[PDB]
Symmetry: D3
Subunit: 151 residues, 6 copies
């Protein structure tokens, strides 16, 4: 079997604020498997592609500027319902609506600096994963705790 | 005052995944008192008795085999409303409906591998405590912080 | 921009139970700026002024006595919507109603020993700040991660 | 085959100060396997046998009373060189001589309240294990990470 | 007993890097009692008096400027051998000589940005305590865990 | 004036045991800057190159086999004295000789499963960085806390 995959990206503010280890640890503890990961400064064209569906938003140019202002940690996580559950772990788009215990709820304040990105549907995930990673960048291996995480 | 008690068991997957100390710490921090604790592999008959109310459910056989597949940490915790609060701390039966911050919300994914058990009512607690522990196994002592936790 | 501020006080039980560093860390991680902080045993008169609203309440004398029973860590934190968000972080007045992830949800059990105080509104905040701190005690400085927390 | 084993006991002060989960987590993270564990108030006679080699020391009577003053968490941990390594993890007998990073270096101050006990040699471990546990109390199972901890 | 006390200050870089709660937590966990605490930006004259014996050193002017560049958390901690032990917990003056497990070993890199200060002797401690605090700012209370930390 | 750089790789056992976030966090807290990072399963040929100096050692074939048995997190960290300090943080080659507080001292037991690699000299670091990364994979940005970590 092949389980669901989602695209998670730690934004420049998460890297600048030293929260990379803390964020990854939350996904590891939950039981998800890390499939791919790289560190890079994404180009504006790339980011425009990534946030294309928002190209007509007022905040769009500023968003792209900021996502290009520093490096990003791009990752692919695998697991049962990882897309929806990953979204629950992140919190709401606006940290102000996020609850303590969530990543945005514990670590940030403003929607313009909300430290992380997570695909909002399987459909987006597949598109984002293809945008940021070559197929040969996805590593398949089996977690030793697999049978202790799944029936 | 003779306070309320609940029965909590870390399931085989919690032990296998190295979460014993992490889970116990959550109860200590909260202010609850550890009354009893032992480590053992429960027999299938012992497990059917614990979950006797689920005997006619389709998943019953696989639940018993899973619970017998490794050791369990059985504990009794005491405190004001510990039954109901212990339940809130665990999260929902299905990790997918559990919120970040709860034990199942932070550490597991699937209902069949949901790392922990907590009595659901005082009636159930008293029954589970009697099934798992001999009266001489419950320890009575007073916490030094008692007056800082209770009025 | 001279942002919003709130008064947070770690009650005597929070100090006695060794939770000072743990609580402060939660505010620092979130991105709030520490503006003032002092450690003191507040007098009864000073405490009756602080909780002047609940003077007619039955628990009042008990509250004042416990608040005076040990030292308190008084602080002022600054940030966008810090008053409302600080309240979300603390949880409900009653630890029983506070969710895991919040300060009261993770660390305490009873309303009479609920480890921390946070202003409930901007107006209460301004009043409590004036009551607990002299103007020279509010320190002026900028956080190096300011631009990573705010747009 | 069967690896080395050591007896570890969290003293009454470790339980009272809420460090049970924290200490257990240190052994789990290291990769050691928990073999047995129970919570009890040890009798004075049992404690005199345990510390029989120190019966003529001036602190002996006080050591026995303090060890009997509250419950203890008795455990058996298994692993390659666990006796000697368990000792390095604990720190020196006197917390004053223990380095930060060790259990006593991090959590305590005085030799008379040094929170934990660990066997000092394979011979002692075998004697203490026999003194505190019945054969049926040592659980047999294999860790899922075993092949990731050992060649 | 009249327990020994030491002066600890978290330097401007510790505050800026969000390490205040983390540092305080280490002293609380160890069993030391917080006696006094305040947050302030010290004047250059105040800092020259504090570091008076280093007035002829090359780095002195740079040290006084850095220390005045942001606020400081000034604290007094109490405990058996707290002066010498607090020093052990800090690590070496040069973070590069500091071992993992110590505060400087874990959190910093360069001698000119070494996040914390601790008195180097009882004589110095008493002099620094007098310099930074007035008598009425040192709070006396007894920790509830006192008898579990000391014989 | 660019700073020293070192090559750090989390071995297959570190990934399998869910320690990726925990390890990265230790380097972030210390004040080092992440320059490059990728997740991959290294080929045997790549691994022989990496450990070419040990090719005639008895344990060499087994080393290469295990290093290829799972994915590796390859990273480049930058900072003052990062090569020697990264080494101190890792601990000794044999975990048995590693002190608590170090990565190997806290997380592993045997030399053949010692979770992490770190360049041992500046010369080794430059060779390893060239072997694992392309020049365009190294990201240059400045940390917002730079002036609080360095004079
Ligand atoms: N500056 C600013 N950016 C926003 C706003 N709403 C959305 N964004 C940002 O653009 C990202 C994409 O928006 P959206 O797809 O709705 O949110 P997400 O999928 O939860 O990240 C959000 O994470 C924020 O970084 C806004 O009102 N102001
Ligand atoms: N596979 C599986 N196991 C289930 C299901 N519902 C319950 N269980 C298991 O049964 C245990 C006991 O069920 P129950 O008493 O209803 O829930 P709990 O008290 O919340 O644990 C749960 O904790 C799960 O391990 C289900 O539909 N599927
Ligand atoms: N003993 C006791 N104290 C209470 C009760 N309700 C409130 N308090 C105390 O009074 C404090 C202030 O009350 P309130 O303004 O209602 O809540 P808060 O603003 O959330 O602290 C509470 O935090 C408690 O310490 C109660 O029913 N009993
Ligand atoms: N009060 C008191 N207890 C001591 C003293 N020396 C040793 N002990 C206690 O004796 C225990 C057993 O002593 P020992 O075998 O020498 O040390 P250990 O094997 O490192 O625990 C120590 O752990 C302390 O709890 C002392 O001087 N005073
Ligand atoms: N910039 C710089 N500061 C130094 C140097 N040596 C000492 N200092 C600073 O001077 C402070 C006090 O020095 P000292 O009293 O000798 O060390 P401490 O008591 O361990 O802090 C140290 O904590 C450093 O912040 C140095 O060589 N360069
Ligand atoms: N199985 C095994 N592997 C070893 C032994 N010594 C070294 N290694 C492995 O080889 C790697 C390379 O060794 P070396 O460069 O000497 O030490 P390092 O620089 O500290 O990693 C080590 O980190 C261990 O994984 C040994 O005796 N047995
Ligand atoms: Mg001995
Ligand atoms: Mg080598």
């Amino acid at each position: 079997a092949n389980l669901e995959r989602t695209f998670i990206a730690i934004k420049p503010d998460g890297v600048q604020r030293g929260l990379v280890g803390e964020i990854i640890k939350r996904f590891e503890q939950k039981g998800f498997r890390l499939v791919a990961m790289k560190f890079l400064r994404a180009s504006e064209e790339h980011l425009k592609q990534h946030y294309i569906d928002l190209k007509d938003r007022p905040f769009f140019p500023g968003l792209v500027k900021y996502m290009n202002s520093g490096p990003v940690v791009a990752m692919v996580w695998e697991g049962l319902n990882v897309v929806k559950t990953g979204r629950v772990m992140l919190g709401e788009t606006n940290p102000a609506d996020s609850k303590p215990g969530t990543i945005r709820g514990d670590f940030c304040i403003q929607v313009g600096r909300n430290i992380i990105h997570g695909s909002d549907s399987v459909k987006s995930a597949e598109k984002e994963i293809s945008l940021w990673f070559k197929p040969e960048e996805l590593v398949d291996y089996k977690s030793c705790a697999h049978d202790w995480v799944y029936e």
